[PDB]
Write a protein that holds these residues in place. Sequence first.
Motif, PDB file in Angstrom:
ATOM      1  N   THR A 104       0.825  -1.202   0.000  1.00  0.00           N
ATOM      2  CA  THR A 104       0.000   0.000   0.000  1.00  0.00           C
ATOM      3  C   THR A 104       0.861   1.255   0.000  1.00  0.00           C
ATOM      4  OG1 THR A 104      -1.857  -1.097   1.084  1.00  0.00           O
ATOM      5  CG2 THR A 104      -1.702   1.282   1.310  1.00  0.00           C
ATOM      6  N   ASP A 105       1.894   1.281   0.841  1.00  0.00           N
ATOM      7  CA  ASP A 105       2.772   2.442   0.910  1.00  0.00           C
ATOM      8  C   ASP A 105       3.469   2.684  -0.420  1.00  0.00           C
ATOM      9  OD1 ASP A 105       5.904   3.200   1.472  1.00  0.00           O
ATOM     10  OD2 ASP A 105       4.581   4.347   2.775  1.00  0.00           O
ATOM     11  N   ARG A 106       3.951   1.616  -1.054  1.00  0.00           N
ATOM     12  CA  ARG A 106       4.710   1.757  -2.290  1.00  0.00           C
ATOM     13  C   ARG A 106       3.811   2.129  -3.459  1.00  0.00           C
ATOM     14  NH1 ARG A 106       8.580  -0.926  -4.946  1.00  0.00           N
ATOM     15  NH2 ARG A 106       9.996   0.816  -4.557  1.00  0.00           N
ATOM     16  N   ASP A 107       2.591   1.591  -3.493  1.00  0.00           N
ATOM     17  CA  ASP A 107       1.650   1.970  -4.540  1.00  0.00           C
ATOM     18  C   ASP A 107       1.331   3.453  -4.468  1.00  0.00           C
ATOM     19  OD1 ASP A 107       1.619  -0.602  -5.445  1.00  0.00           O
ATOM     20  OD2 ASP A 107      -0.374  -1.092  -4.677  1.00  0.00           O
ATOM     21  N   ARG A 108       1.150   3.975  -3.259  1.00  0.00           N
ATOM     22  CA  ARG A 108       0.883   5.395  -3.094  1.00  0.00           C
ATOM     23  C   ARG A 108       2.071   6.231  -3.544  1.00  0.00           C
ATOM     24  NH1 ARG A 108       0.802  10.058   0.481  1.00  0.00           N
ATOM     25  NH2 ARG A 108       2.546   9.606   1.896  1.00  0.00           N
ATOM     26  N   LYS A 109       3.275   5.851  -3.118  1.00  0.00           N
ATOM     27  CA  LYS A 109       4.461   6.616  -3.481  1.00  0.00           C
ATOM     28  C   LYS A 109       4.684   6.598  -4.986  1.00  0.00           C
ATOM     29  CE  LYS A 109       8.454   5.478  -1.469  1.00  0.00           C
ATOM     30  NZ  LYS A 109       8.840   4.652  -2.650  1.00  0.00           N
ATOM     31  N   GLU A 110       4.471   5.446  -5.620  1.00  0.00           N
ATOM     32  CA  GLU A 110       4.648   5.358  -7.063  1.00  0.00           C
ATOM     33  C   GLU A 110       3.667   6.256  -7.793  1.00  0.00           C
ATOM     34  OE1 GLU A 110       6.976   4.479  -8.433  1.00  0.00           O
ATOM     35  OE2 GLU A 110       6.618   3.958 -10.524  1.00  0.00           O
ATOM     36  N   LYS A 111       2.415   6.281  -7.346  1.00  0.00           N
ATOM     37  CA  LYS A 111       1.422   7.139  -7.977  1.00  0.00           C
ATOM     38  C   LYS A 111       1.813   8.606  -7.866  1.00  0.00           C
ATOM     39  CE  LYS A 111      -3.522   8.023  -8.075  1.00  0.00           C
ATOM     40  NZ  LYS A 111      -4.120   8.407  -6.767  1.00  0.00           N
ATOM     41  N   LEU A 112       2.342   9.018  -6.715  1.00  0.00           N
ATOM     42  CA  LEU A 112       2.757  10.407  -6.561  1.00  0.00           C
ATOM     43  C   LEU A 112       3.921  10.748  -7.482  1.00  0.00           C
ATOM     44  CD1 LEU A 112       2.408  10.742  -2.711  1.00  0.00           C
ATOM     45  CD2 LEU A 112       0.952  11.731  -4.465  1.00  0.00           C
ATOM     46  N   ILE A 113       4.893   9.845  -7.612  1.00  0.00           N
ATOM     47  CA  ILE A 113       6.035  10.114  -8.483  1.00  0.00           C
ATOM     48  C   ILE A 113       5.581  10.231  -9.930  1.00  0.00           C
ATOM     49  CG2 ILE A 113       8.179   9.184  -9.376  1.00  0.00           C
ATOM     50  CD1 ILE A 113       8.544   7.886  -6.554  1.00  0.00           C
ATOM     51  N   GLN A 114       4.660   9.369 -10.348  1.00  0.00           N
ATOM     52  CA  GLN A 114       4.179   9.387 -11.720  1.00  0.00           C
ATOM     53  C   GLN A 114       3.373  10.636 -12.043  1.00  0.00           C
ATOM     54  OE1 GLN A 114       2.827   4.900 -12.259  1.00  0.00           O
ATOM     55  NE2 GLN A 114       3.349   5.902 -14.200  1.00  0.00           N
ATOM     56  N   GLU A 115       3.011  11.426 -11.038  1.00  0.00           N
ATOM     57  CA  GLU A 115       2.279  12.669 -11.231  1.00  0.00           C
ATOM     58  C   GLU A 115       3.112  13.888 -10.861  1.00  0.00           C
ATOM     59  OE1 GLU A 115      -1.065  12.009  -8.735  1.00  0.00           O
ATOM     60  OE2 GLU A 115      -1.869  10.391  -9.974  1.00  0.00           O
ATOM     61  N   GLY A 116       4.393  13.702 -10.557  1.00  0.00           N
ATOM     62  CA  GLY A 116       5.251  14.809 -10.196  1.00  0.00           C
ATOM     63  C   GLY A 116       4.897  15.482  -8.894  1.00  0.00           C
ATOM     64  N   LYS A 117       4.133  14.822  -8.028  1.00  0.00           N
ATOM     65  CA  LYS A 117       3.683  15.438  -6.790  1.00  0.00           C
ATOM     66  C   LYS A 117       4.490  15.011  -5.574  1.00  0.00           C
ATOM     67  CE  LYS A 117      -1.050  15.939  -7.963  1.00  0.00           C
ATOM     68  NZ  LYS A 117      -0.648  17.293  -7.491  1.00  0.00           N
ATOM     69  N   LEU A 118       5.373  14.030  -5.709  1.00  0.00           N
ATOM     70  CA  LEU A 118       6.294  13.674  -4.642  1.00  0.00           C
ATOM     71  C   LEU A 118       7.556  14.507  -4.793  1.00  0.00           C
ATOM     72  CD1 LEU A 118       6.553  11.308  -2.339  1.00  0.00           C
ATOM     73  CD2 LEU A 118       8.286  10.476  -3.915  1.00  0.00           C
ATOM     74  N   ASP A 119       7.945  15.184  -3.720  1.00  0.00           N
ATOM     75  CA  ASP A 119       9.092  16.082  -3.755  1.00  0.00           C
ATOM     76  C   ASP A 119      10.374  15.266  -3.660  1.00  0.00           C
ATOM     77  OD1 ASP A 119      10.606  18.498  -3.662  1.00  0.00           O
ATOM     78  OD2 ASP A 119      10.696  18.294  -1.479  1.00  0.00           O
ATOM     79  N   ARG A 120      11.125  15.218  -4.754  1.00  0.00           N
ATOM     80  CA  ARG A 120      12.426  14.568  -4.822  1.00  0.00           C
ATOM     81  C   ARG A 120      13.477  15.546  -5.318  1.00  0.00           C
ATOM     82  NH1 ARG A 120      12.077  10.098  -8.858  1.00  0.00           N
ATOM     83  NH2 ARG A 120      12.859   8.388  -7.557  1.00  0.00           N
ATOM     84  N   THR A 121      13.389  16.799  -4.871  1.00  0.00           N
ATOM     85  CA  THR A 121      14.209  17.861  -5.441  1.00  0.00           C
ATOM     86  C   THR A 121      15.691  17.514  -5.406  1.00  0.00           C
ATOM     87  OG1 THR A 121      12.540  19.428  -4.676  1.00  0.00           O
ATOM     88  CG2 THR A 121      14.667  20.322  -5.346  1.00  0.00           C
ATOM     89  N   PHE A 122      16.188  17.068  -4.257  1.00  0.00           N
ATOM     90  CA  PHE A 122      17.608  16.802  -4.075  1.00  0.00           C
ATOM     91  C   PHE A 122      17.906  15.318  -3.916  1.00  0.00           C
ATOM     92  CE2 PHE A 122      16.718  20.947  -1.983  1.00  0.00           C
ATOM     93  CZ  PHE A 122      17.216  21.725  -2.990  1.00  0.00           C
ATOM     94  N   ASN A 123      17.014  14.454  -4.377  1.00  0.00           N
ATOM     95  CA  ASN A 123      17.128  13.019  -4.151  1.00  0.00           C
ATOM     96  C   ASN A 123      17.904  12.399  -5.308  1.00  0.00           C
ATOM     97  OD1 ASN A 123      16.633  10.349  -3.230  1.00  0.00           O
ATOM     98  ND2 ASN A 123      14.809  10.261  -4.518  1.00  0.00           N
ATOM     99  N   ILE A 124      19.193  12.134  -5.099  1.00  0.00           N
ATOM    100  CA  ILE A 124      20.017  11.536  -6.144  1.00  0.00           C
ATOM    101  C   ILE A 124      20.883  10.416  -5.583  1.00  0.00           C
ATOM    102  CG2 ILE A 124      20.008  13.539  -7.641  1.00  0.00           C
ATOM    103  CD1 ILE A 124      22.896  14.074  -6.467  1.00  0.00           C
ATOM    104  N   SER A 125      20.617  10.004  -4.350  1.00  0.00           N
ATOM    105  CA  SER A 125      21.259   8.843  -3.754  1.00  0.00           C
ATOM    106  C   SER A 125      20.195   7.801  -3.460  1.00  0.00           C
ATOM    107  CB  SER A 125      22.003   9.213  -2.472  1.00  0.00           C
ATOM    108  OG  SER A 125      23.269   9.765  -2.757  1.00  0.00           O
ATOM    109  N   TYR A 126      20.400   6.588  -3.951  1.00  0.00           N
ATOM    110  CA  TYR A 126      19.458   5.507  -3.687  1.00  0.00           C
ATOM    111  C   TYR A 126      20.160   4.157  -3.677  1.00  0.00           C
ATOM    112  CZ  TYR A 126      19.520   4.461  -8.684  1.00  0.00           C
ATOM    113  OH  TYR A 126      19.914   4.140  -9.954  1.00  0.00           O
TER     114      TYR A 126
END
Lengths: 126, 104, 84, 79, 155, 67, 171, 220, 459, 170, 120
Positions: A104-126
Amino acid sequence: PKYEASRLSSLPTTLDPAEYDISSETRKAQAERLAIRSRLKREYQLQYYDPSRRGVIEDPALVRWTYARSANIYPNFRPNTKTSLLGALFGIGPLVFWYYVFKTDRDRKEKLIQEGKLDRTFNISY
Amino acid sequence: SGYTPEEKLRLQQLRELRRRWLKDQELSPREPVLPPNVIYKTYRHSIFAFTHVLIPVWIIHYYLKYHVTTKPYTIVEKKPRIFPGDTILETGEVIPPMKEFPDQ
Amino acid sequence: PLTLEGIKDRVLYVLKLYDKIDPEKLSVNSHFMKDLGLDSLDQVEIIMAMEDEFGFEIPDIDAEKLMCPQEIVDYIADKKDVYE
Amino acid sequence: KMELPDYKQWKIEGTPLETVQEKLAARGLRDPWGRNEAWRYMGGFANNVSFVGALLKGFKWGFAAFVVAIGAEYYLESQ
Amino acid sequence: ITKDMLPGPYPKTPEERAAAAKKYNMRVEDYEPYPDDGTGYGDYPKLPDRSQQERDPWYDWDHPDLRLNWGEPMHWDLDMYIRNRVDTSPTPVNWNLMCKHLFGFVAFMLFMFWVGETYPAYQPVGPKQYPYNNLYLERGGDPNKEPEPVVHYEI
Amino acid sequence: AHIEPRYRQFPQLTRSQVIQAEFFSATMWFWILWRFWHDSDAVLGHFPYPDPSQWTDEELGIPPDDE
Amino acid sequence: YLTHQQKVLRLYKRALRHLESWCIHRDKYRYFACLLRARFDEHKNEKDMVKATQLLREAEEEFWHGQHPQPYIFPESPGGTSYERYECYKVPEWCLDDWHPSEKAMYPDYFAKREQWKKLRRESWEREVKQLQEETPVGGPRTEALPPARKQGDLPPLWWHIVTRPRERPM
Amino acid sequence: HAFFKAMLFMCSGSIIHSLNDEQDIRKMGGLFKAMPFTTTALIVGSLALTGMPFLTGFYSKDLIIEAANTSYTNAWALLMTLIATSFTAIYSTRIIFFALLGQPRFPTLVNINENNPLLINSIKRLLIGSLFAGYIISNNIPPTTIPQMTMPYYLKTTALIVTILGFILALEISNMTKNLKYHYPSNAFKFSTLLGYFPTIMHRLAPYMNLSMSQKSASS
Amino acid sequence: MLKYIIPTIMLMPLTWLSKNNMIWVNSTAHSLLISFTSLLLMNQFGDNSLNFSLLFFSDSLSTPLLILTMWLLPLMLMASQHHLSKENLTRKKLFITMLISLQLFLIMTFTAMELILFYILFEATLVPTLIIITRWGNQTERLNAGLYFLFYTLAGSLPLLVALIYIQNTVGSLNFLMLQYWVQPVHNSWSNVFMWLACMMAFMVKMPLYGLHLWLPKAHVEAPIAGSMVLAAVLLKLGGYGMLRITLILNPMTDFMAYPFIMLSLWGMIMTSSICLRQTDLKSLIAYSSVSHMALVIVAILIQTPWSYMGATALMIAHGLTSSMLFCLANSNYERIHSRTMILARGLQTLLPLMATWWLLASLTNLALPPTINLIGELFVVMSTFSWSNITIILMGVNMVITALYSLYMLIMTQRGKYTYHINNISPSFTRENALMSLHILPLLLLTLNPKIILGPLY
Amino acid sequence: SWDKDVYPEPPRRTPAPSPQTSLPNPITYLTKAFDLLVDRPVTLVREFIERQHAKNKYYYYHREFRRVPDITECQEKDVLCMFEAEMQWRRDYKVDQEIVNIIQERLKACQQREGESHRQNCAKELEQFTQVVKAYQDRYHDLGAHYSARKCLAKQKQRMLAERKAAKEA
Amino acid sequence: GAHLARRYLGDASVEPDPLRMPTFPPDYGFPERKEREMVATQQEMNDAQLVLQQRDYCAHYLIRFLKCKRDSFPNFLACKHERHDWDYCEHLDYVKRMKEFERERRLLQRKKRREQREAD
Ligand SMILES: CCCCCCCCCCCCO[C@@H]1O[C@H](CO)[C@@H](O[C@H]2O[C@H](CO)[C@@H](O)[C@H](O)[C@H]2O)[C@H](O)[C@H]1O
Ligand SMILES: CCCCCCCCCCCCO[C@@H]1O[C@H](CO)[C@@H](O[C@H]2O[C@H](CO)[C@@H](O)[C@H](O)[C@H]2O)[C@H](O)[C@H]1O
Ligand SMILES: CCCCCCCCCCCCO[C@@H]1O[C@H](CO)[C@@H](O[C@H]2O[C@H](CO)[C@@H](O)[C@H](O)[C@H]2O)[C@H](O)[C@H]1O
Ligand SMILES: CCCCCCCCCCCCO[C@@H]1O[C@H](CO)[C@@H](O[C@H]2O[C@H](CO)[C@@H](O)[C@H](O)[C@H]2O)[C@H](O)[C@H]1O
Ligand SMILES: CCCCCCCCCCCCO[C@@H]1O[C@H](CO)[C@@H](O[C@H]2O[C@H](CO)[C@@H](O)[C@H](O)[C@H]2O)[C@H](O)[C@H]1O
Ligand SMILES: *C(=O)CCCCCCCCCCCCC
């Protein structure tokens, strides 16, 4: 106010009603209990004090305990209503619970990323 | 409540042995047999400062001066505060004073 | 740093400050019951006074057997590794 | 080796242990261990300060040095 | 150790119960196995669920740290009942009463923190005032834009 | 040792410990008194606290009811 | 397993220690220690055992209600702040047998005397075992009590680990 | 806090050593004159802890209380903080009263001795710090905030007032222990003594449940 | 790789042609020399792997695994030579031959270019390992441990053989360099689901995955010390190395096929950590500790991020030294008291001071005290799983608490408290045992000074 | 020692000593003692070491990589071309990681240097960091552990497709 | 405290809201109201590296104090006069905030008193 014993707070001996009903039968039982302890104490001491003994005095009681806590369990296991429910509830249940929490958590996060609504401004380490 | 005669005798016999054993733990005069003012307080403090302050600070300063500070951004200092009326050593610039205050 | 005689001196000192004991009829071998006329409640108090004197506890199983001053001295000397 | 002070000197008179013996006397009781406690109320243990006295330890000399220190300050600011 | 001196299956007959008690060095009257569900206890004795802290510390135990004697039957959960882990000793306050007061104290404090959050204390002052449009540039505001002026008057 | 234990009596004392203890107790009280002579504001209050109820309506810019 | 007298005397000692924990001050404790002794004295001569057991039963309930939740414990007693503190310094005597010869050479006189104690232990063991055999009932020992030496020149059976045990303050 | 709290432990170590590892204050007493230097350090440390004006603790604690009083904050949290300040004076009095004052309650063989120079010098340095360190630090650090120095008199002096009342209330409680009256424990007394039962419940229930699961379920 | 394969083979004639009393001296001396030369594999490039020939290659993943493997052989020989003292000469040389053959199979396994060559050597390791357990273990249960070990492995490995042969038919090659370029995406179908399972289950069993781990506590409790060391240190990492390579050709199907195994691992690590708190056998406790640590590695490999792959590599190397050291520590006690029961011998710090220090250092690495490479590996996995899903921090954090409790419970139970009175044969630590412990901990801690060499290709 | 253009530093403005006390400054004397006891001996040892280095001058070089056709020019399955394009992409990936590291170092140095005024005075460095992190994220984020030029190209083409679609409909 | 009882127990419609004040125009009842003057420039507080919370209408006194502290080292007992000046300026700043609260309180009371006129 009387003492209310619990699993993790035993009843004090001085407040035990049976600690004062010491009949001839109970005194006989206590003597027999002391007889076993004295017999085992003598068996241990004859080895413990032996000047020529170097090593470990093997204790059958300790051997029986470690054996009971492992090797003897499956031979005395019976699949019945009790062990099946505990097996299912405790073994399978947590795996299903965590699958839905993470799915459930990952489905929600994926949906937000696919809509540009999850803030990943400085996220370049994974 | 009291020692039985047999208990008294055993305690007495163990008591004699225990005291002999404890007496046997005493070291003899030769054991162990080992195989083969103000100024002296300045010396220890002088040698200690030399081997624990001067030598380490020689090593660190050399390390910092010729290895660490020869690389970008390894030692970064907050720039000095500049107040009105100050003079800059690098340029000789003079920072003007603040306006005239109202009286308070 | 206790000694055998130091222990005896203090054990007898405490008993000489107990009002129920005639300080003149008191010897290291006096039996608290047969020689001094005390009872078992007096015996408990004497043991408690010895624990306070020497700053350690004597368990009831051991305490109930000490019936004369010399036995108290022997008990204390044993627990404290006093051999002189 | 160690000399124990003579035991006869330990008396409950002049101590609060005497007060207890009087309270127990009213009821018909007696305190047989009183002399074993007397040493705690005699000698250098007889008088101890109150809580205020404990807090005021060194106040007499601290205050004396204060007056001199400020007396000197007034003298300097006078000149 | 021979197989006859090792734990076995749950004892069905009184002769087996008498034999199991002997193997575990217990009185047949004191010997009681765990209930014969399918949990795998076998004939191992069920002993009182007490911490080793509850045992007499003045007795001359063979294992003083554990307060165990050599050859006595060990509790199934001995390793949980060592003196470093679960204590079952009697408590001066009843267990149930102890839980009521601890939970009650915590619940009261949490309630009062919500109250104090809804009715905060403060002083009778207006907001702190800052120059230069509330320090728009210093707080990182964009130099190229223009804030609506923030004006502060004397009083 | 230099200080021998006593039985049921007040312990032996040295001059050094008594004098040193007194000097530092006196230093504590001199310091408190000296500091309070110069810095009583740190304890009693640095600045006066005004009474808001005694400010006039003129200086607060409060117009009369008919305005 | 404790007689009635033993139970009553243990309660008296335990109640005085908790009473002293409450009172703190010596004069105050002396006052209430005498009042408490009077209560035990008021029933000292009770003869009807049923009545006496009821008195003891009730006294234990009264003790439980009024015990100190944090009584004074002697520092080295079980549960005290110094209990077991020096166990990490207690080393068994058999460890000395494994010392390197150059370590033993540092204490020639101590180890000569130790060798005599081991000789004494060896020469005495068989007699110790024999005495225990011939003094133990057929079924076995019924108590943990041990006898003394009977003959002169004999040692009390099972003495080694009591006599040679570590000192209470081994370092 | 580092100065006077370290000193307080060393003072208690001095007493504990003198009384042969005794740590119960009920077995102390009468040490005010027997251990004069430890007594002096213990009084100074106690005063620094409770915020006596111009000792080391005053230069942080009193600013903290003033700042909390005049801040926009949870009102209940503010009251809890102020009450705990009064309790600081109560338990400090408890140590001084039972350890130093009154008549000795320790064993008869007196071995009191605090004359080792390592003991004296180490406590002495922390004593000097517990007097002057706070003043010296406050007068050298640069300002980084705007301290709030305007406030009603009753917000300025709250820390001193509730501390003094704590001392007065503590003294009455302590002196009442000398009366020949035997009191029975309340529930509040047992709650405080046994630490609100948090260790008794949590340190038994949580290990038991976790350790029971480990064997019964996960393992078996 | 011939410069390592051939000298490894030469250890066999060396052992068989040695004087009777020099088999341990000779084999130990020359296996240490081989380990020294293994450092030449550190010639790694930022872009390309070190590609020796059509058969063998080494990159930043296989290099640290090779150096660990060649380091362990001399340590195993030192650990074994005491309990084998009474064995007759020919049977000693056979034991050493099995250890050498295991090293030969392992170095070829970690450098095989072709996945089917990897499979064959991956599977050859079963034979010497099974022989070591069942022939030189002490207890009756070793025969059953051998069977569980054998058939758990083959149950998953035979499906892997079919999948690999199928892949070569479809793609045309199993060469790993070729697969890096010819890999195609895996589409959703029931055919590919079972292809995915056949490709992964053999490696999951070896890790072992929670639920397929029952063979492992059997194998350790029964194996001799050298069998336990290589089983814990290296053989578990065959599974991790296998997945790290094969996951290349399973994307994007791993996006969802990983879920059941991440759940088993995330929950499994807590279950197996809790189990350690109630274990009565010291060897069984250390065995269950491995299951919990490898659960992190499975999660790290399955979520496929640069940080998780670096953490997985560091964890595998760090656990290799820590776990093998713990077995050696437990064995040293066993050689004196001849029992694995944890509670039997206590307070050993009083009797063996320096050994207690090795116990402390092994415990601190086991609970991942920073900046040990144990902590570096675990932290990198924690960082990457948090990005996978923030809630994993709850499970990862709880497991850190439990790991400390059982790591220090084992330390406190055996080293502290009071010594057992009747155990009077605790002779002083031998120079051999102390050297064995230092040759674990010293390289482990030295790696903290230069972690990059054990972080793998993603560095 | 290092390029100031790559690692910029604003000109340094130190105030001159302007004492308003009659007490000596303990730092000034300590500064003089440090230069005498620590700096001067250290400089002599280094000057001797530099003399030995001057006798044995030799050189090393920064490796230069010629450009090769990238993955977009490679025919499908042609490992020989894909290999060189893939190796070049991997080298560029490592370089871009270090470019981000340089920008982050600039940003961190500015924050410390500017003290309490850093929020206003490091806007330029924060902007450049923001832009370079965005570009780096676009290139390389979400590729996975088994990243490649092929996957990176697939990611870019998806982004170009979205940008075309948005532009067209707009 | 007093004001808190009035708002939380008494009538909260005639007590200032500390989080929303001011609610009346600054020139309401205040013909020709002057502006607060700022003595320290933005660049001066930037070079002094004042903490942002310290960059208020008293900053010129803080800057003067900070300069004295640096110039009087190691004499940490100097600059008391400069410290007092900054402290005093802050006191007046606080009193000004106290007047703002009282001005708002009286205007709110006037409004309610006036809104009774428009319905009595
Ligand atoms: C400055 C401090 C600020 C915080 C102060 C917090 C105080 C709040 C205390 C809340 C706890 C009260 O908890 C309450 O205690 C009483 C007293 O026994 C209990 O009372 C009950 O138990 C007792 C004893 O068994 C019996 O007389 C009876 O059953 C009943 O009275 C309640 O069942 C319990 O709910
Ligand atoms: C800038 C100044 C800094 C602060 C300087 C403060 C200097 C103060 C020096 C004080 C020295 C006092 O020295 C000490 O005083 C106490 C006063 O009770 C004396 O003590 C005297 O009274 C007490 C009881 O009240 C008993 O010990 C005894 O009756 C007697 O000795 C000590 O015998 C003396 O040694
Ligand atoms: C045409 C093709 C023929 C190819 C043959 C190539 C090898 C020929 C080897 C001949 C020599 C064999 O040597 C014979 O076996 C062994 C090994 O040396 C010797 O004895 C051995 O004892 C022990 C091992 O048990 C070791 O010290 C050592 O291996 C050797 O000394 C015999 O004493 C010798 O008689
Ligand atoms: C971690 C330590 C490991 C210890 C390993 C111990 C075994 C050492 C094996 C040494 C092998 C040396 O092998 C040989 O070295 C010489 C250097 O003299 C090299 O000599 C060559 O090096 C390079 C080759 O590009 C050129 O400068 C030139 O052609 C020549 O100097 C040979 O190319 C190599 O065949
Ligand atoms: C530890 C145990 C682990 C177990 C893991 C189980 C994972 C289960 C994965 C489910 C996805 C399987 O793959 C899925 O199968 C369905 C058929 O049902 C396929 O469905 C296919 O045939 C159907 C016909 O019915 C078509 O409608 C559909 O267009 C087509 O995709 C999908 O192509 C594929 O998405
Ligand atoms: C006036 O100047 C304000 C000073 C703050 C006084 C604090 C009052 C504490 C009341 C207890 C809080 C209860 C929760 C509503």
